[PDB]
Amino acid sequence: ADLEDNMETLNDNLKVIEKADNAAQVKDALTKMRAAALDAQKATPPKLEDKSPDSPEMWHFRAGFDHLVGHIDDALKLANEGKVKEAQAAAEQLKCHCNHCHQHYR
Amino acid sequence: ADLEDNMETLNDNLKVIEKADNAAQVKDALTKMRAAALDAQKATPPKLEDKSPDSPEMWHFRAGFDHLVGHIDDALKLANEGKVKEAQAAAEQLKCHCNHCHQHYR
Ligand code: HEC
Numbered sequence A, B: 001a002d003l004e005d006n007m008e009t010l011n012d013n014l015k016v017i018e019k020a021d022n023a024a025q026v027k028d029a030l031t032k033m034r035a036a037a038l039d040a041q042k043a044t045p046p047k048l049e050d051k052s053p054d055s056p057e058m059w060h061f062r063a064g065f066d067h068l069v070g071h072i073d074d075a076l077k078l079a080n081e082g083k084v085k086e087a088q089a090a091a092e093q094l095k096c097h098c099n100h101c102h103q104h105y106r
């Protein structure tokens, strides 16, 4: 959808992952998070409306989603190994990506 | 100084900023962190000793310090413009940079 919908999706599924106790639930939530992050990367945040596409600010904004997606992919691999707790710990650590982008651009 | 020397400097001074009794101590600690990070950026982590200066792992390692230096510079700017409580709040967010790189390479 749009950036507000993608953001609550990300937040909702972090909670799902912390709640869960098996690999399938974690995998499903991470998969949902991955789609939301890639969709949000296409948007321009309101505080960067007139910035150029390759501007330093737009570059760092887009890079933040690439990096979030990379670490979602890393947590997905752990869940696919049956390493539930390690996948959950990796998911919890995604909050650093949320907070970093927010402090720049939210 | 080698890598774990720089890491001790980063660890000690991040704690100084949180506990500092005055603003001059915040700036001085941020300055020491910045120097340690730029030195550490020129190191090879032991888990990557088998990688070239061009490996994707060495690239992400170097970029982590670039980004940490940028955010130290942001906090230094707050401190230099007299907004030292804001600089302290920004320094607290630096721990995510530590945790992210450690997740990969520590
Ligand atoms: C940039 C690279 C971001 C990353 C990574 C994450 N978010 Fe985000 N978020 C971003 C912006 C620019 C905004 C402002 C939206 C606006 O239209 O002003 C937000 C906002 C949120 C919100 C609030 C939703 C709202 O309608 O205001 C939430 C709940 C949120 N973000 C959650 C969130 C989480 C949990 C993230 C990590 C998993 C995350 N975001 C990453 C930009 C970016």
Ligand code: HEC
Pocket (backbone or CB within 6 Å): B003, B004, B007, B008, B010, B011, B014, B045, B046, B060, B061, B062, B063, B064, B065, B068, B094, B095, B097, B098, B099, B101, B102, B105, B106
């Ligand atoms: C990569 C870009 C890193 C960033 C950013 C930070 N650290 Fe780090 N740290 C990194 C590596 C590769 C290692 C292992 C070094 C080794 O030779 O094994 C470390 C290690 C530490 C340690 C342990 C020190 C030791 O004697 O082994 C500490 C206390 C430490 N790091 C602290 C630290 C802090 C507080 C950081 C943020 C401010 C931080 N590091 C960033 C790689 C990276």
Ligand code: NI
Pocket (backbone or CB within 6 Å): A067, A070, A071, B060, B100, B104
């Ligand atoms: Ni990473």
Ligand code: NI
Pocket (backbone or CB within 6 Å): A060, A100, A104, B067, B070, B071
């Ligand atoms: Ni940044």
